[PDB]
Amino acid sequence: MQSIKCVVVGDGAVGKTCLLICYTTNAFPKEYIPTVFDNYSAQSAVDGRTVNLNLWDTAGQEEYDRLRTLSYPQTNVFVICFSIASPPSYENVRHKWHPEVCHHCPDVPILLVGTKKDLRAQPDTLRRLKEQGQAPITPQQGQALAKQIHAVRYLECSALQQDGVKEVFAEAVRAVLNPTP
Amino acid sequence: MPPPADIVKVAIEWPGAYPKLMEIDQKKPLSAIIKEVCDGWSLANHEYFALQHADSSNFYITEKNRNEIKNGTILRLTTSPA
Ligand SMILES: Nc1nc2c(ncn2[C@@H]2O[C@H](COP(=O)(O)OP(=O)(O)O)[C@@H](O)[C@H]2O)c(=O)[nH]1
Ligand SMILES: [Mg+2]
């Protein structure tokens, strides 16, 4: 077979842990626990081929900045997440996450992922964001950010609904096995 | 008063090698932990090595203080002092 190291990064609470646990266990975490680091594995059929994924969960908090970058050596692909329901986490892709992974792993492919798409049209989220003068990220905005940071692709998912999660990691594999110029 | 955790997550650096992110079994002797760490970096003679805080304190890790290590602490593999 063939293994691939995939690290998932992004702001605290954007949904990194639920993404990974849903993908690898088909269960949605019952309780939020801050991540320190976690190494998961998956074997996935991707375009008729069986691939091993060596998956890493990271702490998004600035408190663990140095710890997180110790997980980056030998990474083959980064999945950078922002929450569709938190525009500040989108801006931190531009200001923190994309520059940090490129600083540590020059030219390593990046998949951009908008999480929690089930919240985009939820009235309560819409009302809470409106009190902050905000609105959920649109798919076109997600594409525009992917273009800006030279991500291989923008994808959206809801780990809670188990909607689009499989496709994120299949595209991560393709970024390593079928490099695009 | 609550007891310490029996497993703790740490990162360990060895200058020139790739870092190791691992969970430490706190019921396992520190020497066995160091042997596991050393094995990963193709190092033998583990009793000639020690773990020390990577941050500015640079305290050495011992059987008597390993209970104070929190999850997410960065350690450095070094030569034992004595
Ligand atoms: N509505 C919704 N909530 C989510 C989703 N994924 C995660 N969450 C919630 O968002 C919070 C943070 O999720 P988590 O995966 O731990 O984020 P992390 O801090 O990036 O690891 C938790 O309360 C989760 O239940 C999702 O797809 N939809
Ligand atoms: Mg997490």
Numbering used by the authors:
A (entry chain A): 1 to 181
B (entry chain B): 1 to 82
What did the publication describing this PDB structure actually write?
Next, we determined the crystal structure of ELMO1-RBD in complex with RhoG at 1.6 Å resolution. The asymmetric unit contained four virtually identical complexes of ELMO1-RBD and active form of RhoG. ELMO1-RBD interacted with RhoG via β1, β2, and β4, whereas Raf-RBD, a conventional Ras effector, uses β2 and α1 for binding to Ras. The interface buried Leu21 (β2) of ELMO1 in a cleft formed by RhoG switch 1 and 2 regions. Nearby, multiple hydrophobic interactions were observed, as well as two electrostatic interactions between Lys9 (β1) of ELMO1 and RhoG switch 1 region and between Glu13 (β2) of ELMO1 and RhoG switch 2 region. Substitution of Lys9, Glu13 and buried Leu21 of ELMO1-RBD with alanine (K9A, E13A, L21A) dramatically reduced its binding affinity to RhoG in the active GTPγS-bound form. Mutations of several residues at the periphery of the interface (Y18A and K20E) also slightly reduced its binding affinity to RhoG, but a mutation at a distal position (N58A) had no effect. Furthermore, two ELMO1-specific residues, Tyr18 and Pro19, were found to interact with Gln74 and Pro73 of RhoG, respectively. The weak binding of ELMO1 to Rac1 is probably due to the substitution of Thr69 in RhoG with Pro69 in Rac1, which breaks α2 helix in switch 2. Furthermore, Cdc42, in which Trp56 in RhoG/Rac1 is replaced by Phe56, showed even weaker binding to ELMO1-RBD. Thus, the present crystal structure clearly provides structural evidence that ELMO1 binds preferentially to RhoG.
